[PDB]
Amino acid sequence: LQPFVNLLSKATYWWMNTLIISAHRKPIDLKAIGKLPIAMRAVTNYVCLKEAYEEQKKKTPSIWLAMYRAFGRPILLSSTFRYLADLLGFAGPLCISGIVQRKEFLENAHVLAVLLFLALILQRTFLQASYYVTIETGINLRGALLAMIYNKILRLSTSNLSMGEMTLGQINNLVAIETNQLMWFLFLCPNLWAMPVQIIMGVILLYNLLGSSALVGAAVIVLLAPIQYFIATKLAEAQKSTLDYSTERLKKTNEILKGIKLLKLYAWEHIFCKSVEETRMKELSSLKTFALYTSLSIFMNAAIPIAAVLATFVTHAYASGNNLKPAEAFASLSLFHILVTPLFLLSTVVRFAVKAIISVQKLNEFLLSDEIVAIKVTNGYFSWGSGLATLSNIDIRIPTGQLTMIVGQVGCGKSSLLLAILGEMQTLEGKVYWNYSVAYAAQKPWLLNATVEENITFGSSFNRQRYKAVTDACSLQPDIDLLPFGDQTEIGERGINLSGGQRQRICVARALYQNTNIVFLDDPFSALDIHLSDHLMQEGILKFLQDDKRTVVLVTHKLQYLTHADWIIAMKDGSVLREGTLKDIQTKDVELYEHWKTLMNRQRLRTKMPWKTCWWYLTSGGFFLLFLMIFSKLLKHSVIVAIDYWLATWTSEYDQTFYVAGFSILCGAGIFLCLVTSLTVEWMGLTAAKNLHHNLLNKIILGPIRFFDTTPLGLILNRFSADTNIIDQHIPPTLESLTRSTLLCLSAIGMISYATPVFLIALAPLGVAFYFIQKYFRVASKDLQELDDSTQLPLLCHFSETAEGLTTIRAFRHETRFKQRMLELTDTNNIAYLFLSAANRWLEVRTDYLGACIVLTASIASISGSSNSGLVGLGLLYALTITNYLNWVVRNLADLEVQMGAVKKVNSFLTMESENYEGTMDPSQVPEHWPQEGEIKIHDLCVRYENNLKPVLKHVKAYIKPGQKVGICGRTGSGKSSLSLAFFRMVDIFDGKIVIDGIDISKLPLHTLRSRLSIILQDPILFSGSIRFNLDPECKCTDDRLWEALEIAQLKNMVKSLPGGLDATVTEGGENFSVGQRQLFCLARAFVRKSSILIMDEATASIDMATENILQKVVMTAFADRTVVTIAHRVHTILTADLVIVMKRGNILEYDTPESLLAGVFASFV
């Protein structure tokens, strides 16, 4: 008995029942979901797939044959289950015919009801078993493919010829999408054979039941596959265009958020809002065609069946002597409902098959890519794959336990020599003799997305003693302390960015820490200060490494410390000039030794569905559209039910002109209302998306700066990228499907109840059962989706990590550890996805048994209760129909809940408070040339960044003469920038008042105040587009004024050199210019602003010495007339000022002419 009970448990997915039921007390964390059975682990699947692929390559090799030889048996079994399911499912129409007409007990009309019940139960059990088996094999294939491509990545070659700039993109695409497309094709694989057979058998059954008149309907419906494929192609094209425009919009939005403070200061927030709204309008224009084609798809899907039914029954009435009997009519109707789904989804199956062919071609093209005392080399020619000898005639020697520095000119080949030693380059000749893992500090530093502690340890055992030794020797303890968490701090692309010097120091620390006898350091001092380099060499290279008697080779152009080098390698143009000790080199090569000296001298609580947010989304478009949607859908479903009831009435009898006319009118109304409802739903979706995004962008850009400082930019960009995409594309189709399924189920229930009143007694318990299933599945699946996504993200992150810095991994010999990590991550992701699919199967099976119970009850009650044969057929038809949609209603309800979560996020963002833009003072009281005078005063200023915080500035009072140069200085965190922000009003004023030109700055429309004031920040920021755009996006000044400003800033020559002059394009972040160039561009912007007041915060900061001097000259000359308030670090510049206000942790402190306070914290700083 036990094996049979276990088979039943595996058939109804009872093993997921406990998990789903426990999804209430505690969310489903990874502990609840056990580990994969050894059969489904990624290691075994990878072994099988690799074995098959190698067998293929034994005799060009095809991934298709390897995949078949690996996972053909599971899919063959799934196909067998699918065929049995189709055969049993065609017991619906046949049994409907038998029951509607009514030793051989099969015609008793009661045994047929229980036969229908059993056949339906077996059909759905087999169908769900087939789905689960195909999904299991698909996930196994995804695991195997990920492991195989990861091994190839580990075995890739780093030559620029093969691993191009887009190689990382290709690998990431393979991991993310291509493998997913192949997995989905595996999921849908049984359909490619199950659906054509089902369609052919359905058409044959229609022909047998309904005479030759079934051919017309069969052809009309079969025309539904080409149409669906055509509109699917159109949808793909429209979605590609929409994604392009959305990417442009998101680039603009990200640029806006990154540097919001500067935009708000410069009153350019609304200009960039208009710029983003232009791209949003284009995206909505594209989405209009996308939604039009989606509406056409839904209209075809819901209308072609009705047109086919109309044609079939008109032809049968006007071309067959016998009248339309009830049994045959409703059997044909059920067969049409059965065949509509295969014909609609065959297009999707074929589309995925084509995409999988493309994906496999891409994967194969990738897999066919280029790959591959202490140390002595002899007669070694190394090439990067081109064929030319990049390095020739190498006779290098690296004595054990000694320092061997390799020096040469740039482009010499030193890094190439190290990589060749590591085996990353093809060895045309020669050999490399080892007398094992070697620590490698790549010339380009590489850091994992893990924490600093893990990155520096890099998998080795933690030793606080050695950790501190390396950190102090690396001089990284201060930079570590400055981190928000110190150790255990996220870094890398996703983590907190670090300066290049910090990254290189981290990499050098990693190389030093690990226990290896050979250490390869390549230009560790490229991004380090002279003092930092000296400390690193004296403490780490000389002492720390010599303590363990390790072997170190250092590649650096800094000839300094060449005396400390036990061995020296002189290389030039890919060839060793001389190798040996400094004294030996000088004795043998006097010229070289003297040459180096020349360079030396040079210097769960909540689970309720969000109904409030759902209603808010529904009403967002407008009450008229919502009313039209509801009315159109109700009228369409009433017309469809009327069509079926009119069919029943027509078949009741047993001339036909009246019935045919009425039926044709009803079918025409049905198709017209299908079109109307599709258009209305898409219209509502479009209006909702437009309104929501418009309001969200406006509110966010108009919000306070404190919000931007608090909320990470990641969250806001996610609200603009993921939530916006959901609202645009996923919500409308999901709502359409949910409403269609809900109304179909309700109409079926109502029609069954009317035809068979007794059905309500058995409907009462099934309602409770369905409610419980709905609740439990909704919560469980909502949790499992989050689990799956959170598990998926680290997998792509790890693939990106391994793709980069491959040389570091293969130099540490830590490839095995990374491979094991990948196997663990992919196993976790696969188990998460598999259990999500298992929850789906659980729900589907329970709802299938519920539908079987509904069908049994409806059949028995209708047979018992006398009724028109047509009415009995109608009841049975709807009892079969409700079964197919009971599952989809709940699944779409869960999806709608998930998406209303995102809409709730957007709504919450809409509720953010807005800055007090409105100014108390009358606009008419603000003269146009208000800031011309330059008069400025302060009255015990007290500014707090946010309420309930200690005042950054407290009781500051000062007077500034018109057209006067004022200076500001102080130690870090002294509140210097607080005064500037108060000037601009961005930072709220806790107490006091500031008067500019005899007006209260606080009591003014903040836009006017911001526009007519000039501010320069520490790091210059440039916005994408033309130079003219950056000079004045408002376009409220003559073009020649821009040339005058450029000439004043001394940038006229640079602009002229670039093509197009003022129209020369500019890249985000100033990548098209040097830092000094960006700073002088900002200075030119301030000049063209003609504010007459200049505020500078670290203008010289991050500025070249020549850049600093030219900026100082420009400030002295151009802005002489206008007031200048300088907040700088170097006191040198402020010396030329006439009034300096130094502050210390909230105190006006010193205020007098530079000489006045020199009669003395200022003197100490100077």
Ligand SMILES: CCOc1cc(CC(=O)N[C@@H](CC(C)C)c2ccccc2N2CCCCC2)ccc1C(=O)O
């Ligand atoms: C992650 C998807 O894993 C599945 C995988 C399957 C296997 C499968 O050949 N389905 C047929 C549907 C059957 C009823 C015709 C199909 C065909 C084309 C497109 C999508 C689909 N299906 C995929 C979802 C959209 C409609 C049904 C079933 C169900 C699932 C599932 O979600 O649980």
Ligand SMILES: Nc1ncnc2c1ncn2[C@@H]1O[C@H](COP(=O)(O)OP(=O)(O)OP(=O)(O)O)[C@@H](O)[C@H]1O
């Ligand atoms: N990964 C690579 N793939 C292909 N060719 C490379 C690669 N790295 C360097 N080369 C080429 O090999 C030759 C020497 O490269 P190498 O890395 O030694 O440059 P370098 O400027 O001497 O380095 P360093 O920064 O250490 O001074 C040059 O032709 C360089 O273009």
Ligand SMILES: Nc1ncnc2c1ncn2[C@@H]1O[C@H](COP(=O)(O)OP(=O)(O)O)[C@@H](O)[C@H]1O
């Ligand atoms: N966005 C902010 N929100 C709240 N407080 C801040 C913010 N920025 C700086 N502060 C606080 O204000 C004080 C003054 O810093 P400040 O003088 O502006 O720095 P800097 O010298 O770099 O200009 C600091 O001690 C800091 O903690």
Ligand SMILES: [Mg+2]
């Ligand atoms: Mg190099």
Ligand SMILES: [Mg+2]
């Ligand atoms: Mg500052």
